[PDB]
Ligand binder design. Structure first.
Ligand SMILES: [Mg+2]
Ligand SMILES: [Mg+2]
Ligand SMILES: [Mg+2]
Ligand SMILES: [Mg+2]
Ligand SMILES: [Mg+2]
Ligand SMILES: [Mg+2]
Ligand SMILES: [Mg+2]
Ligand SMILES: [Mg+2]
Ligand SMILES: [Mg+2]
Ligand SMILES: [Mg+2]
Ligand SMILES: [Mg+2]
Ligand SMILES: [Mg+2]
Ligand SMILES: [Mg+2]
Ligand SMILES: [Mg+2]
Ligand SMILES: [Mg+2]
Ligand SMILES: [Mg+2]
Ligand SMILES: [Mg+2]
Ligand SMILES: [Zn+2]
Lengths: 148, 108, 308, 166, 238, 153, 292
RNA sequence: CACCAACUUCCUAAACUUAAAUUGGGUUAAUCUAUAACUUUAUAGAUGCAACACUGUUAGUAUGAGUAACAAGAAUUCAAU
């Protein structure tokens, strides 16, 4: 599936940790049904856990839309422009609470194979190896067998 | 002998799109100066030739009417004359075929 | 159309210019060929003497046909007639460039028209100042035997009594079977043989599960370069530049052949007597008889043979 | 069935602004249900690809295949409508952008055999498609030169990275 | 075994044309309904010099009242409100509004602003085209010029002198006939019509009259080739 | 191997070849211009040339009469050969027949065709390939070269 | 600097094109009838002062476009790219017509005009090259000639075999460019301004202006190069296939100014010559050509 | 005088310890009915309830293959000579 799928390298949206850490998640949309067995758990999330999540994350704008609905859905939008949608159909408060926190911590970067666990922009301090390093010079720079 | 395996489109596509099997482009096509229709360099024009043969059929029709039957070929030279022309002294004693139309420009 | 079009020398020539160009092209052939008739007076390259182990140039000739010939012993020998025709030396390489130990000379014979030839070949001859030749061939020549390019060669370059080797393309037989290509026996005509008379038998054995490379099979027969070794020279006709060579020569009549001294062990250094660089008629040291014969040959106009 | 090729001629683009390159005209034409094999028709359709209208007609007029005459008629029909209906100013200012053969709706019959046996005959039909674009034929492809090949080799070398490390 | 050869039968015409058929004419049980009549009852001949004038014409019509005003009486008999004093203005509204539809291509509205002899003469040669018609000021006021009547139809030719702009384009947006935006003055005679009898009949544009003495219209930008006679090998040019 | 053989294999066999060519020759003599396949017209051209030679020999020649009798199946043509065609070609030493290639036959076999005729006939002239005029650019330059070469010796 | 002259001359040439093009307002249709042997009776309605004889050939087919080198508009030869002015009769002339005299002259002039362009830019900017005239010589002469006055420093210098070969290498590069032969009929006033520096051109311009009732002169441009012309010219520089600068002969009575005539030979794509025939015709094109 | 090497074992996080006829258990795709839901869902009750394979059945389309094989005597002035 690696050859059947795309890949990328480890990265951050705007050098997130260098100067100041900024939370990537910027919007949550939750659509609910006032009376629907599938949306019962999501309803309890609004009653109990939505306000506390909203306060902990003041940079995330949260929209709650009770409406005649068949499946409750969560839409998460990020600064880099990624959009993620989740079925919340017939999930407990514990599952929806767990899912919502995972979305906040994530970045918009696509969840695909990451080629290397590490990444540097300044790999070398002392100079990158080239074939001449560890080769001693010769007087007058005479190549082998040169008469002069 | 029967095939042991079905042949793939990728194998077949190489065989039937090989240059050896493609239609070769022709460099010998040119125009007829008189009619402006296309012709090959080494063959006669099919449009100018069509004019000649249609006139030839008309003449051969007239010859048959004059003879009136099989095995009536003359033992003397033949000549064709068009309206407004009369036999010359050199034309004496030669079968004359008469055509209603005027002398064609090409025919001399 | 703004595309490729075909042309040939005659397409745009008028009726009058058609004859004029023909006479002009033939006129040039005359003047060019008479310019090279005198090699020795046109800065000839130095003429080294013969030393053992030398190899001199050969000639390209046309195959006229065959005729009978007799010796003073009464034996009849079928002989082939080879005509040396517009044979000139064309190119010289040194030992280094040819990559052999020995050097190379390229000769060419049988001048041809100039009208259906590539521009490349025509430029090659225009530099050399010769009309185009039908065929090129390469001869291995030692340094002492090098001859300057543009030098004509003549049948007198060979003399009766020397043995020679001729190489030419054999007569083509087209695609053939296995009986006529390799002399396979085949299968019986009757007694139950079903649809197998001239067919190859078993290709190979069952074990190897393949056909060995080089297995003899039906294919295209003839049109190959072959060489005949050790053919005696019975007579040379200096007037018409005809060489009489014992026996058969590969190829059809009017086929060009390559003639050079024989490379067989016996006649290793027989070119001592022959003109070592080549035979120069421009030198005119002595004027040759019209017909040169080998001593055993019975010449016509001689008294009838009486083995007294 | 599907007959989209005919409707491709009914697209209407909005008026172009004065400061914009003039859009070349495009004409789509087809002949449906030709009693001819699409495979055999491919060679004829292939040959005239990219050639100009007059060049294609010259090549077709001297071809001995049945499809050659059929393709010629389609091209003449396409040429006339281009001037008559698609505001093409010059007849000669056209080249064959696309030309391909498609399978048609065939028939099933019986081909008799020697021993009371038979096989399934197919009476094959094909379609022929062309798109004509106003303007001279695009220039032919030029093979890559030795210097062109060498530069690509050097780019291949320069792209290299140290693999599986920091 | 096998399957049977069913013959498996804009198509009936070919079927019967190849086979050939006796198509006896049929008497239409319901008579076809016509809301307008092809042609003009009396084609008004525009007097010479009627253009390039920078009311006298209206006086001439008053003189022709012998053959025209009597028709107006009939127009009043069925409506009793058709006054040639105010009609000129209403005529302009139709004309201007009708032509505007072409820009949108609101063929729906046109059918309510033109008759069945003008719609085919306004849209047929504009399919797969994007016209752009705009009305610049009118040089002089419109004037009635001829009123005729014949189930019963009445036509009131109107004379208008206005300035307009037209910029027809191809499918590909390329310009074909006109200048993008440049006014040109036009003196055209329009022929309105109405079905007096029908309760739901009104005034719609029927046709236009082209004086012989009119100047030639602007030519198309593109250059045309008119093919000469095509000759078979038998024939020769003359 | 068919090296050196100067005949095509036509018809049902050797006899059938002669009869097929014989009918074409009989048509050519009667009509003086015939259309046939290029291969068959090429095969019959040689007999067309030689037939005129026999006519030249003369009416009184018995060998000519027997040969003319065999080849002309319609016997009215025998006077024509001896008294019309042969007198016409008295001056010429050869090349009595003119053979040209015409477009391929439009009959689903796409045969290669040719029109074969006797020279000097009364029919409308064939549209022969005509060479360029001396007034063309290339011809004039060649004409210019010719004048200089002849005038200057 | 020579570059300054080319830049200034080009601007006036470009300026004149716009001036005359602007002078003609609107689009006017003209009836031009095809009077040629083939496709007779065709009538082209074309735009006045914009359409050209080539545009008429465009309608018929691509064969006319390739094969038509000149056209007779009312019995006079017209450049294929020269705009038409009025309703007229048009006929297309090719190299292979029975009477190609007009085509032969037009081709011969164009080859000489190309020869002038190559020469001027071949020599180093340090030296000075002055073109004097393009002589009118019959095709029978065997070569087209162009007269040039070079710098005094070169009066004792004669081009070598490679120098004439290089001159030809550039001509076979002008051909590859495939440049159209632009045409203008311009008043004497503008022509003199574009050729003010060259005295030889000025007098030539005067002779042509004197001949015509008006002061109209014919100017032709190949890329940057501009020149006066004796008459119509070939549509494009791609018509040529074989080109050759053959021999340079210095006119003997040339003491006040050493005027050197460079000769050449060319053949179109339509009438190509075999390898040997080219040789002979070129050798015969290396002999001094007198003007008659 | 050693190195290399099978998650054998350690390490971070986890996990709690071995061909296959057969046996025990936890979920579930689809559709219908009851009552709800209202961009396609929930709890129950039901069933012709899930196919990479039976020389499976029907239909379609390939491969072999544009291959094996098939056909009209000639010319002309053409229900003709
Ligand atoms: Mg492969
Ligand atoms: Mg045997
Ligand atoms: Mg047998
Ligand atoms: Mg093996
Ligand atoms: Mg049976
Ligand atoms: Mg099958
Ligand atoms: Mg053979
Ligand atoms: Mg043979
Ligand atoms: Mg383990
Ligand atoms: Mg198991
Ligand atoms: Mg089931
Ligand atoms: Mg299935
Ligand atoms: Mg099986
Ligand atoms: Mg199955
Ligand atoms: Mg198949
Ligand atoms: Mg096979
Ligand atoms: Mg077969
Ligand atoms: Zn013709």
């Amino acid at each position: 599936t690696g050859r059947g799928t795309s890949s990328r390298f480890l990265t951050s949206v705007l050098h997130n940790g260098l100067g100041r850490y900024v939370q990537q998640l910027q919007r949550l949309s939750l659509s609910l049904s006032r009376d629907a067995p599938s949306s019962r758990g999501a309803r309890e999330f609004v009653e109990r856990e939505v306000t506390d999540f909203a306060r902990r994350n003041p940079g995330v704008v949260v929209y709650v839309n009770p409406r005649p609905c068949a499946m409750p859905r969560i839409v998460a939008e990020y600064l880099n422009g990624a959009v993620r949608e989740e079925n919340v159909n017939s999930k407990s408060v514990e599952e929806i609470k767990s899912l919502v926190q995972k979305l906040a911590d994530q970045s918009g970067l696509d969840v695909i194979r990451i080629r290397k666990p590490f990444h540097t922009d300044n790999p070398s301090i002392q100079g990158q190896w080239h074939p001449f390093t560890n080769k001693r010079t010769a007087l007058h720079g005479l190549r082998p067998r040169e008469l002069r | 002998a029967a095939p042991k395996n079905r042949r793939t489109i990728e194998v077949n596509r190489c065989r039937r799109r090989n240059p050896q099997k493609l239609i070769k482009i022709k460099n010998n096509i040119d125009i007829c100066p008189e009619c402006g229709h296309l012709k090959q360099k080494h063959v006669l024009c099919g449009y100018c030739y069509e004019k000649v043969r249609q006139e030839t059929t008309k003449i051969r029709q007239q010859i048959g009417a004059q003879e009136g039957g099989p095995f009536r070929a003359p033992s003397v030279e033949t000549m064709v004359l068009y309206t407004g022309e009369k036999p010359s002294e050199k034309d004496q004693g030669k079968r004359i075929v008469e055509r209603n139309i005027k002398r064609p420009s090409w025919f001399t | 159309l703004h595309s490729k079009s075909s042309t040939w020398w005659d397409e745009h020539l008028s009726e009058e210019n058609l004859s004029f160009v023909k006479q002009l092209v033939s006129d040039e052939n005359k003047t060019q060929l008479t310019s090279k008739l005198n090699p020795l007076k046109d800065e000839p390259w130095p003429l080294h003497p013969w030393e053992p182990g030398s190899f001199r140039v050969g000639l390209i000739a046309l195959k006229l046909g065959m005729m009978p010939l007799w010796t003073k012993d009464g034996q009849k020998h079928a002989v082939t007639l080879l005509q040396v025709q517009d044979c000139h030396v064309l190119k010289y390489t040194p030992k280094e460039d040819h990559n052999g130990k020995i050097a190379a000379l390229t000769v060419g014979g049988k001048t041809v028209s100039r009208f259906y030839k590539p521009d490349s070949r025509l430029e090659f001859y225009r530099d050399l100042g010769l009309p185009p030749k039908q065929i090129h061939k390469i001869f291995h020549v030692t340094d002492n035997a090098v001859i300057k390019p543009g030098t004509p060669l003549y049948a007198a370059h060979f003399r009766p009594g020397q043995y020679v080797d001729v190489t030419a393309k054999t007569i083509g037989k087209g695609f053939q079977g296995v009986m006529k290509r390799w002399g396979f026996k085949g299968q019986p005509a009757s007694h139950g043989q079903t649809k197998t008379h001239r067919r190859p038998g078993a290709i190979s054995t069952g074990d190897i599960a393949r056909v060995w490379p080089g297995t003899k099979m039906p294919g295209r027969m003839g049109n190959q370069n072959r060489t005949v070794y050790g053919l005696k020279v019975w007579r040379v006709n200096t007037k018409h530049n005809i060489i009489y060579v014992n026996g058969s020569v590969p190829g059809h009549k009017n086929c060009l052949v390559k003639i050079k001294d024989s490379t067989l062990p016996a006649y290793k250094d027989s070119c001592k007597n022959l003109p070592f660089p080549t035979y120069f008629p421009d030198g005119d040291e002595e004027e040759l008889p019209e017909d040169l014969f080998d001593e055993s040959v019975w010449q016509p106009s001689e008294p009838s043979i009486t083995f007294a | 069935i599907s007959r989209k090729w005919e409707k491709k001629n009914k697209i209407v683009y909005p008026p172009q602004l004065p400061g914009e390159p003039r859009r070349p005209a495009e004409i789509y034409h087809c002949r449906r249900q030709i009693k001819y094999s699409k495979d055999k028709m491919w060679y004829l359709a292939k040959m005239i690809r990219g050639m100009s209208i007059d060049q294609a007609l010259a090549q077709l007029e001297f071809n001995d295949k049945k499809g050659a005459q059929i393709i010629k008629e389609v091209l003449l029909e396409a040429q006339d409508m281009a001037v008559r209906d698609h505001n093409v100013e010059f007849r000669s200012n056209l080249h064959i952008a696309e030309s391909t053969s498609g399978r048609g709706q065939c028939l099933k019959r019986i081909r008799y055999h020697g021993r009371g046996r038979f096989g399934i005959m197919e009476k094959v039909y094909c379609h022929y498609f062309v798109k004509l674009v106003e303007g001279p034929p695009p220039p032919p492809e030029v093979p890559k030169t030795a210097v062109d090949h060498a530069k690509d080799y050097i780019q291949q070398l320069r792209s290299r990275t140290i693999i599986h490390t920091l | 075994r096998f399957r049977p050869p069913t013959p498996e039968p804009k198509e009936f015409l070919e079927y019967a044309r190849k086979a050939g058929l006796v198509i006896p004419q049929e008497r239409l049980e319901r008579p076809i309904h016509l809301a307008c009549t092809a042609g003009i009852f009396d084609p008004y001949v525009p007097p010479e010099g009627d253009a390039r004038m920078s009311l006298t014409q209206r006086t001439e019509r008053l003189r022709k009242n012998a053959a025209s005003q009597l028709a107006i009486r009939k127009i009043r008999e069925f409506d009793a409100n058709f006054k040639t004093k105010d009609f000129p203005e209403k005529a302009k509204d139709i004309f201007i509004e009708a032509h505007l539809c072409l820009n949108n291509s609101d063929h729906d509205r046109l059918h309510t602003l033109v008759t069945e002899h003008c719609f085919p003469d306004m849209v047929w040669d504009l399919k797969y085209k994007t016209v752009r018609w705009g009305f610049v000021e009118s040089l002089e006021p419109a004037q009635v010029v001829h009123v005729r009547c014949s189930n019963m139809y009445g036509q009131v030719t109107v004379r208008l002198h206005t300035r307009q702009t037209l910029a027809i384009y191809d499918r590909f947006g390329r310009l074909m006939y006109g200048q993008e935006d440049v006014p040109k003055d036009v003196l055209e005679y329009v022929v309105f019509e109405r079905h007096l009898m029908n309760p739901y009949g009104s005034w719609r544009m029927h046709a236009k009259i082209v004086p012989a003495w009119a100047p030639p219209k602007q030519p198309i930008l593109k250059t045309l080739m008119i093919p000469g006679p095509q000759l078979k090998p038998w024939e020769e040019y003359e | 191997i068919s090296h050196g053989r100067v005949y095509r294999r036509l018809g049902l066999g050797p006899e059938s070849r002669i009869h097929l060519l014989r009918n074409l020759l009989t048509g050519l003599v009667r009509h003086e211009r015939i259309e046939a396949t290029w291969a068959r017209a090429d095969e019959m051209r040689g007999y067309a040339e030689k037939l005129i030679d026999y006519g030249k020999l003369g009416d009184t020649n018995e060998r000519a009469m027997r040969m003319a009798d065999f080849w002309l199946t319609e016997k009215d043509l025998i006077p024509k050969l001896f008294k019309v065609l042969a007198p016409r070609f008295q001056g010429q030493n050869g090349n009595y027949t003119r053979m040209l290639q015409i477009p391929n036959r439009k009959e689903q076999d796409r045969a290669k065709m040719a029109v074969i005729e006797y020279k000097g006939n009364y029919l409308p002239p064939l549209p022969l390939p005509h060479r360029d005029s001396n007034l063309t650019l290339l011809n004039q330059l060649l004409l210019g070269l010719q004048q200089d070469l002849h005038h200057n010796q | 600097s020579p570059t300054e002259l080319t830049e200034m001359r080009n601007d006036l040439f470009n300026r004149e094109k716009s001036r005359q093009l602007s002078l003609t307002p609107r689009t006017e249709k003209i009836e031009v009838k095809h009077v040629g042997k083939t496709d007779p009776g065709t009538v082209f309605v074309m735009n006045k002062n914009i359409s050209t004889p080539y545009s008429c050939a465009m309608h018929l087919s691509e064969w006319y476009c390739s094969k038509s080198i000149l056209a007779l508009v009312d019995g006079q030869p017209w450049d294929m790219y020269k705009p038409l002015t009025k309703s007229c009769e048009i006929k297309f002339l090719t190299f292979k017509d029975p009477d190609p005299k007009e085509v032969n002259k037009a081709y011969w002039r164009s080859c000489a005009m190309m020869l002038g362009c190559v020469i001027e830019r071949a020599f180093k900017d340090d030296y000075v090259v002055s073109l004097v005239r393009a002589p009118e010589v019959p095709v029978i002469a065997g070569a087209f000639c162009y007269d040039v006055t070079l710098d005094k420093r070169l009066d004792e210098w004669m081009p070598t075999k490679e120098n004439l070969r290089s001159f030809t290498k550039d001509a076979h590069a002008l051909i590859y460019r495939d440049l159209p032969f632009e045409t203008l009929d311009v008043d004497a006033r503008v022509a003199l301004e574009i050729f003010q520096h060259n005295k030889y051109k000025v007098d030539f311009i005067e002779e042509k202006a004197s001949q015509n009732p008006e002061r109209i002169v014919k100017l032709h441009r190949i890329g940057d190069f501009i020149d006066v012309s004796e008459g119509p010219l070939i549509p494009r520089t791609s018509v040529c296939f074989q080109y050759e600068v053959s021999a340079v002969h210095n006119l003997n009575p040339s003491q006040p100014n050493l005027i050197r005539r460079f000769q050449g030979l060319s053949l179109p794509t339509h009438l190509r010559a075999q390898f040997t025939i080219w040789d002979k015709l070129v050798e015969r094109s290396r002999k001094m050509v007198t003007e008659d």
